[PDB]
Design a protein around this ligand. Structure first.
Ligand code: CAZ
Length: 258
């Protein structure tokens, strides 16, 4: 608590301007300082579960030789809307690793469904999160304030730190997870818009419908100092700009010059 919100930032006003709810957690892994605004509230995961899904696939690959290179063929019935990579390989198949990269880097929806099958579904992914110490994450599916398919900004950040910088994955798989996040293409207007171009950054986004429920989590490597891990989640007013604005406030609250 002593290193949390050492520097106040105007998150409440940003949230009022947005009209919905915003949740933010950011940690400076060098000092332990944090910034936290609604950080323990539940927000919809939307597609952000797919980063953790890819990590779970990598963890499984430590025990299951050949998993990543396994070819997966699927039918047209698997191609739900917003499957921009998998729809181009319907007639050929894709490997598990390719599906993972597509889920992470293009938020390919069909690819994520196919990988969830590999893990035994939402409960399997939830079990992986429990296995790394995350008691908040819940994926339920394949209501106002619906708790299904939610986590908190804090738990998302803590789990992201364990997987990308800590020991939850073996080193080769950790670096592959980082590389997948670094190559994401869907986040240029979110956390990345608050981060200087000469800093490395990996992220995964989520967008639930068009009304402003959206999110992003990222690892950021400022040059010359320890990495920062952060998560920004929103619930729509009854947003891409708001996420970037909240990330800027989080970095400012950590004293990180951008
Ligand atoms: C993950 O968040 C995916 N999102 C969706 O499939 C949903 N909506 O997609 C759009 C295109 C916004 C829609 O209005 O249909 C959705 C609605 S409710 C729910 N649980 N998901 C993909 N991921 C991203 C991202 O930001 O990573 C998108 C930009 C949309 S597709």
């Amino acid at each position: 608590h002593m290193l949390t919100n050492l520097v106040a930032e105007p998150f409440a006003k940003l949230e009022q301007d947005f009209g919905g709810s915003i949740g933010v957690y950011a940690m400076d892994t060098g000092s332990g300082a944090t910034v936290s605004y609604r950080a323990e509230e539940r927000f919809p995961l939307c597609s952000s579960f797919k980063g953790f899904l890819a990590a779970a696939v990598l963890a499984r690959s430590q025990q299951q030789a050949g998993l990543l290179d396994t070819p997966i063929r699927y039918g047209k019935n698997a191609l739900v809307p917003w499957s921009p990579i998998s729809e181009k390989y319907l007639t050929t198949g894709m490997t598990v690793a390719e599906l993972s990269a597509a889920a992470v880097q293009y938020s390919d929806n069909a690819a994520a469904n196919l990988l969830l099958k590999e893990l035994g579904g939402p409960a399997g992914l939830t079990a992986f999160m429990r296995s790394i110490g995350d008691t908040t994450f819940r994926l339920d599916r394949w209501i106002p304030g619906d708790a299904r398919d939610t986590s908190s900004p804090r738990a998302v950040t803590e789990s992201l730190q364990k997987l990308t910088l800590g020991s939850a994955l073996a080193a080769p798989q950790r670096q592959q997870f980082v590389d997948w996040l670094k190559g994401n293409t869907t986040g240029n207007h979110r956390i990345r818009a608050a981060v200087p171009a000469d800093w490395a950054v990996g992220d995964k986004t989520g967008t639930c419908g068009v009304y402003g429920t959206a999110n992003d989590y990222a690892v950021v490597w400022p040059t010359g100092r320890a990495p920062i891990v952060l998560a920004v989640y929103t619930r729509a007013p009854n947003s891409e700009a708001v996420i970037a604005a909240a990330a800027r406030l989080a970095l400012e609250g950590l004293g990180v010059n951008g």
